[PDB]
Ligand binder design. Structure first.
Ligand SMILES: CCCCCCCC/C=C\CCCCCCCC(=O)O
Length: 131
């Protein structure tokens, strides 16, 4: 977990639009969500680990205890029952909302954080540079 903790900036995204569509994200948010390069800052608070995200649209904060379920109102408004754990190396973040399910597996590949969003059989991939 000590390797995820840093100020990250997005550098390259891929297939996110297709993923956003899959999630059923509204047109408006898709337009901003497609151009916006956000900053995901991951840090701690002892039993808590936080994930702040900053963009020229929305900034969203989640604080949780690993493996513990919690409620999170996603940026695109879905209210999910999320759980994020460490399946070893990878930081998995599961989001469940009215029957549908989705997951985010963040990794550190050659010192670059790579997130790989997934829903149904439509995967999306993101890249982050430690700034
Ligand atoms: C924080 C809002 C701006 C960044 C997200 C833009 C896309 C908006 C709606 C779709 C959400 C999919 C689940 C959240 C992914 C966040 C990715 C990130 O932190 O960069």
């Amino acid at each position: 977990v000590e390797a995820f903790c840093a100020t990250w900036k997005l550098t390259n995204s891929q297939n996110f639009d297709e993923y956003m569509k899959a999630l059923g994200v509204g047109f408006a948010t898709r337009q901003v969500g497609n151009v916006t390069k956000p900053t995901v800052i991951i840090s701690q608070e002892g039993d808590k680990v936080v994930i702040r995200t900053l963009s020229t649209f929305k900034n969203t904060e989640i604080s949780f205890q690993l493996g513990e379920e919690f409620d999170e109102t996603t940026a695109d408004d879905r209210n999910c029952k999320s759980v994020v754990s460490l399946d070893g190396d990878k930081l998995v973040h599961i989001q469940k909302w009215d029957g549908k399910e989705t997951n985010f597996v963040r990794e550190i590949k050659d010192g670059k954080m790579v997130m790989t969003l997934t829903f149904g059989d439509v995967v999306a991939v993101r890249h982050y540079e430690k700034a």
